[PDB]
Amino acid sequence: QECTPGQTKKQDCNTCNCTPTGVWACTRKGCPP
Amino acid sequence: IVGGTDATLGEFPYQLSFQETFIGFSFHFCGASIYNENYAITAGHCVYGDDYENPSGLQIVAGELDMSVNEGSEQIITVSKIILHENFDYNLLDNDISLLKLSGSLTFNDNVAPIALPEQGHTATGDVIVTGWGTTSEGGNTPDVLQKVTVPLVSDEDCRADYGADEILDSMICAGVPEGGKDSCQGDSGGPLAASDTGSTYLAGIVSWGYGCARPGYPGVYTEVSYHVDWIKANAV
Ligand SMILES: [Cl-]
Ligand SMILES: [Cl-]
């Protein structure tokens, strides 16, 4: 339902957590890719 | 920065580029802000995992506008120490703030200058200006010229409808337009959100996180500096 609340992942060099509303909250660093 | 325009040299004299050096290049990965001649303010997640007392290959660049041309005001100074908030939460981004101590002092001039803090507890309001060298669309390209965007603040309660009640802490501040299209993005982390409701420019937020960038209904989320002013003053020597 996009994700389960409390899951974590990486998106390239950024870190993400699944919010209570089911979306990925991700940091905003620049990644050398 | 998504939906912005080009900055001018000296327009944002407090803006820093936070860079890591590798073979063949210096890589911008975060923004930062000048607090005083020896200290920068950035996000905690920009430094988590570093060798805090002996950081290697990290530097700031002050007086920068266009990364692809040396215009003469750039000041590159290596970072000598990182002071990460000791209650930083790497997952949920509570207390997402760090200081960078520089190995030497910045030279202040028209193009290089501190940004004032608010008073502890001040409530920022009005349109605010977010700046950085982040991507210009989600998943997009990065500009060589510093970008600026104006966005309104979104109340914590309104933002919690998007992200969840406990996901937005009071010590976070949200900014964006309901229709989307204006936001910070990847590479803007750690840089400034500047307000001016006191009649003068001050640092109201630090770029932190969001769902994507510039999406309708998903404002950017920032560390709210007025919750951490006493922390900053206690830790910047
Ligand atoms: Cl407007
Ligand atoms: Cl606006």
UniProtKB/Swiss-Prot annotation, chain A:
Disulphide bond pairs: 3-18, 13-31, 16-26
Residues in Pacifastin domain copies: 1-33
Annotated coiled-coil segments of the chain: none
Domain of life: Eukaryota
Positions of the record's site feature: Reactive bond: 28-29
Function: In vitro, is active against alpha-chymotrypsin and trypsin.
Protein name: Protease inhibitor SGPI-1
Protein source organism: Schistocerca gregaria (Desert locust)
Lineage: Eukaryota, Metazoa, Ecdysozoa, Arthropoda, Hexapoda
